[PDB]
Structures are given as C-alpha cells and as structure tokens.
Amino acid sequence: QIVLSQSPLSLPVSLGDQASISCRSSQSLLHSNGNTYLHWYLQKPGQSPKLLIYKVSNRFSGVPDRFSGSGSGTDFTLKISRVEAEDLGVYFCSQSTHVPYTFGGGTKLEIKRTVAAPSVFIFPPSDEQLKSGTASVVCLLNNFYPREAKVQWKVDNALQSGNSQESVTEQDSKDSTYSLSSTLTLSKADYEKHKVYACEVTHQGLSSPVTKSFNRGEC
Amino acid sequence: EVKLEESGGGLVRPGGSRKLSCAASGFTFSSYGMQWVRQAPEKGLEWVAYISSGSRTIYYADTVKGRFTISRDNPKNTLFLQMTSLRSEDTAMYYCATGYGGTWFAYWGQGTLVTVSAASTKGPSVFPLAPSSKSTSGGTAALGCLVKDYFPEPVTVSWNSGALTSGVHTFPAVLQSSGLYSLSSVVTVPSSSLGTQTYICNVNHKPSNTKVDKKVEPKS
Amino acid sequence: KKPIALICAELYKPFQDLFAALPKDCSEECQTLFEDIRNSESHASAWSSALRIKGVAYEGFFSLTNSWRYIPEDLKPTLGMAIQTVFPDKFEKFLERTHLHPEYRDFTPDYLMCRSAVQEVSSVSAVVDRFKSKSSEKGRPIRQEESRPKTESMQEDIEVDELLIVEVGYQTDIEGKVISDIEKWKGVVNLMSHLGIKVNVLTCADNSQTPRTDWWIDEKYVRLLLNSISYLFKELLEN
Ligand SMILES: [Mn+2]
Ligand SMILES: [Mn+2]
C-alpha cells in the first residue's frame, strides 16, 4: 500500500537528448534485509512490459546502457542518457519491498518533432448505414503534432453534445505524429432534418480554428 | 530462452469463473516464485498475485481477495489463476511473470485477454468512408472504413489484404454505452489512383468468426 | 492404604521402560525425581515430584519425536542469549527497546532454534508446516505467530537468519496452554518486527485424553507415559 508517484505524467524529448523520470514512494522501500526493491519497466505500444532496472540501479541483462537508475529510501530516478526512437512508450516504476506489490501510474515518453498542423477531412454517412436507420459522420484530424487538439461538432451551427466520441492513435513510430477521429452519430430521422454538418478543429499549428463542413443534399 | 505463455482467456459473464494457465520454459520453474499482473484497456499495470516456489507463501491484491486463487504444478511447469465471481472491472490483459531470482518482474508473457461482460458476441457492420473533395488535400485523398458495433474486442483491419500499409491509421476501439465496440480505419493515398486502384478494407473478428471485405470507392 | 514406596515398587517395570527410552540427560533427571518420590515423606512432596517427571519426560519424548536435542532447563538459552549470539549487530538496540519490559530478555522457551546454546535446524518453515498440518488434520490446538516488519514481503534474492521458538506441554487445559503461551510471546514478536528480526513462535499441548495416535509425540512414547507417570498419579490419589 505504498503509493508510487511518478513525475512527469508525459515527457516530450528530442532524439539524442537526456530524459529523467521520477518515482516517489509514500514510505521507505528499504527492506529489513538491506535491499531496496524499486524497479523500472518500459511498455512499448502494443507490447508486454519489459524490465529495465531492478533494485534501484541494477540494469537487467541485455538492457541498453543508456538506461540507468538511482535513488534511495523514498526518492528514485530513471535516466535515459540519449533518447532513441525505440524508447517511445510508457515507463513504470514498481515496488516489491511490501505487500501488495504496487506500480506507479506511468510516464509517457513522447518523441519531440516539429509542429505539424492536422489535415482535416470529413466523411458523410454511407447510404448503406443510412438504410439501417443510423448516420455516423466522421471527422479526421490526420498526422498532427503536438497532441493537444480540440474538435467539436456543429449541426446547422448548433453545438452538439452527448452524441460523439473520439479516438486518438499512438504516436507514429516513423514520423512521430498523431491522428484523431471524431464520430458524430445521429438517428437517420434527425440527420435528414438538417443541412450543414461541420467539424471545427483547433490546433496550435493552424492560424485559426478550421471548420470543415458539407451540405447533406450535396455531392 | 526464458518464455512464459498464457492461455485460458476469453469472454465470461459477470458473476462467472475462468481459469488461466501459464506454461514456463527455459529455466528451472520449480525453484522460483511466480506472479500474475493485469492491465485494463488504456490503463496502468496492477499486480494480482504471487506464489512462492514451493507454494508455501501466497499473496493477493486486495481487489481479488476471496475471489481468485493462485496455484502451480511444478512437475508440469505450469502456473494457474482460478478466477471466480468476476466483475466488469476485472476485464484486462492478464500476464504471468517471474523474477527468475527475485520479486521483481524480469520475464513477462504475451498476455491473455479476459473480457467480463454480458454483451453477446457480435461481428461488426462495416461501412465505407468514401474519398471525396471533402477528404482531399493536394495530391492526397483519404478514405477508410467504419467498423461498427462488434464484441468482444479483438478486431484486425488490413487494406488490400495487407499490401497497403503506408498511411494507414486504425484507431483504438471505443467501448459504447451499448456494451459493443466501434472503430474506424483510414488511409491516405494519391488522388491520382482513385478510379484506377481498388481499395478494400479487410476486417477480421475471430471471436465471432466474421470476416468482411469492404470495397471503398469514390462517392458518385 | 498403600505407602508411596510401595507404589513405586509396583510400577518398577513401567518406570524402567520409561527411563530406558528417554534421552540420557532426561532419563537421569527423571530417575533422581523417582527416588525423591520413593523416599517422599509428605503427599505434597510426592505429587510435586511426579509433576516434574511428567513435564520433563514429555519434553524428552518431544525431542526424540522431532530429532531435536533435549535441553535441561538449566542449560536452556534465554531470548537475550539468542539475540546476542545470532543477531549481534542488533543486540544493543534489542536492549534499548526492552528497557520497559526487561523480563523479555529472560524468556526461556522449551526450544529456541535458529536456521543453520541456541540449537540449529535445517528449515524453520518445515517445522511450522508440520505443526499447521497436524492442527488442520487432527484438530489439535496450536498457536503460531511470525514477526513481520510493516507489511514486508518475503524475498528470493538473499537469505536472512531467523529464530524458531517452541513451547510444548503435557497438561489438561490444552486450549488454555496455547492461548496463554502466544499471549506471553506476542510482545516479543512485535518487538522482533521492529528490530527487523525474523522469528516464528509455536505452542502446542497434549493431555492424557488425546487419542494415542494424535499426540505431538510418537505413539510408542505415549504408551510409556500412560503406563508409568499417568498411573503413578492415579495411585497417589487412591492411596
Ligand atoms: Mn519450559
Ligand atoms: Mn513447556
């Protein structure tokens, strides 16, 4: 019931720079046997976690030597001396001095890249789905950086709430961008009651918020 | 080579039971403590249970106490987790792990997915996201597929049977209030190839034995 | 009717069988006590001696059953002696934390062992499991406690020294024996937890109504006690 507090929550870092990740324990991790059971892991996207450092500073066999650990008592630090593209992922500290074994909340290491404004695309519902009585409108924000973006829906200039959902990809391994989808779902009857379907996108890479829209009865 | 291989995952109704197994190789299994760790979708890691080499010492996370039982069979190099009284919150990837000489997690399995839900297994409806002037930029057009209302989770999307990979983005699924999942897959291609290259999204949903191939063509 | 000396005369064989089977130091002390009974002048003197034989002989058979050394009470180590010789680097802080309870230093259990005058055993955990097994199989009352700093987990990458502290007994009130034993040692276990010292405490007891196959001593030894000391007690009352 040691609480492990990691900081920061998210760490953007340029390739070749150093990264530092902190793990603070709510009580000392010094075991009465003299060892300190604080360990460090990396979970790459879509993979199982992987041990980097065990008992504060012992690098696990085969782990690249750019990873090191230090600390004592309640304060511990994981260092990457020179970040590589393959270090993208989530870093966790964990402790096994005390039962229950507990994990920190995770630090997401982000690869820094130059700003990239999203390309914004919109897709009306397909006739096939409309025959089924539902209309999903999809707004796509493609290949942007950094991750912060705002997306809202307007139907005949009325803001929508409660009828959309969004999903964001993991940072791309080759170009370090994100993509985001926002999906507005209306009943067929509601959909055919309106003309203008608009997606409004705010991102620091744009000179102003972009509204991408279509008229229902148009092609 | 040390390897841990989990099995037994799948779909369970709330209140139900499931037993997971973990087959260990590449080291003298009977000399080492073994553990289970889980990860709910999009969330962090959560330790589940520990069993000493000779089964004398067993520890459990408080959230599984009185419901889960960890055990092992040393002659058979197998670790077990008996789960009972399952709840929706137990939905997660379950990993076995060992320190091979300590209480840290030095070796991990690939994991096995347990979904706890009363939703019934269902293949997706697949709808085209057709390219148009509203999805074009420069010499580039975007298109895709909406993969709607499937369950349980595992769904795979490819484009043109795997041949088209550049520019593909398949989004993480969202769990709907209905209890089903939905996602989209998109790809950007040269606008010059529209009407000359055929684009098909291939959707595989093994839990329902559903396979859908949906052709995506310019909206006329 | 019968005089005490004559009581001892009639039980010559049972007591000769008892003495022959006890470990050497245990047998000698029982033989001396038996001659104290033979030559007793007061009924209170004989009974007290018989009581000593009961406890001393039982411990001799507990030792034999467990392949442990029988230790005469005068040579039994105290808790303080065990900390001194097994955990010397913590003995000074053991003294400080025992200033308000200095009788802890002089606690003398029946058996005071450590993992390989404190005796050595090959495995503490094996003894604990033996006790917990017979308690769970035959319903035999035990009490058991292990020290534990905070909520520390066991570990696989290093060994620590540890103590095993065992209290045994032959007496009518078995539940009361183990309840009072574990209560006496509770403060020591808590103290050990604060010192980072791993200890296990075990207490158990038998009485003459325990099924013969169910004692903490081999059944052969149960017969030797029942045929000798137990009748001696019967005969002391009647006459
Ligand atoms: Mn004693
Ligand atoms: Mn005793």
TrEMBL record, chain C:
Q: Where is the composition biased (Basic and acidic residues)?
A: 135-153
Q: Where is this region: Disordered?
A: 135-154
Annotated protein name in UniProt: RNA-directed RNA polymerase L
